[PDB]
Nucleic acid binder design. Structure first.
Ligand code: CL
Ligand code: MN
Ligand code: MN
Length: 191
DNA sequence: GCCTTGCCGGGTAAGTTCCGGCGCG
DNA sequence: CGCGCCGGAACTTACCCGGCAAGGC
């Protein structure tokens, strides 16, 4: 669908490094936000925002992409009730993604939550149920993995992809051309 | 002999929600 | 008056990073 692949990739970034927020203000004002945060403003302006802008155009969302500079990171923000529920409903229906959307979501989740050295292949999150979904997707794709409580202080689990299948994971998932390429896989392919 | 990975602590790159506007029926 | 889109940023921690060493072959 191409739109579905970019949607699933952005959802991984959103669930990873951002969030979906339903705000209630004085009064009774409101706001609906789709957010991705990141330290690198280059990565936000050059990789994340063009993908989000394409999705905004194909969905005929009229809200604009805001890029706000925070004290510790930049924030990509779309203030759109239509886009908020578009991603929210996708999240509740995530267990039904076809293989293409699964690969794209794992791409975005690893860009957000993954070990970027690629020396080890790990994904951190406190949402164990979300990692168990990704775990069964990876197993079905032939990528062996385990889940353990990695941070006993805060309750952060880790999904460790076995290095026995590091080539399978990096080549067939992170480097798939069926959906947008992550930054480090794109630099690897183009040398 | 060394590769893999469970477990851990450091601290910052994330996340979350409040503030003030404004437009529009 | 009610509700949704802008623009900013305060405020806490959930991630990532990287070292250690048990286990396996
Ligand atoms: Cl910064
Ligand atoms: Mn996260
Ligand atoms: Mn991240």
């Amino acid at each position: 669908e191409n739109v579905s692949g970019i949607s699933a990739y952005l959802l991984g970034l959103i669930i990873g490094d951002g969030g979906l927020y339903k705000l209630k203000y004085k009064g009774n004002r409101s706001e609906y936000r789709v957010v991705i945060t990141q330290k690198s403003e280059n990565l936000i302006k050059q990789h994340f925002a063009p993908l989000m802008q394409f999705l905004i155009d194909e969905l005929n969302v009229k809200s604009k992409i805001q890029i706000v500079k925070g004290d510790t990171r930049y924030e990509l923000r779309v203030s759109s009730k239509k886009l908020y529920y578009y991603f929210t409903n996708m999240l509740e229906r995530i267990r039904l993604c076809n293989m293409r959307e699964q690969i794209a979501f794992i791409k975005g989740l690893y860009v957000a939550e993954g070990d970027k050295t690629l020396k080890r292949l790990r994904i951190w999150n406190k949402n164990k149920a979300l990692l168990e979904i990704v775990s069964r997707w990876l197993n079905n794709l032939g990528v062996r993995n385990t889940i353990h409580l990695d941070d006993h202080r805060h309750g952060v689990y880790v999904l460790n992809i076995s290095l026995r299948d590091r080539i399978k994971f990096v080549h067939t998932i992170l480097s798939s051309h069926l959906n947008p390429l992550p930054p480090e896989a794109a630099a690897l392919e183009h040398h």
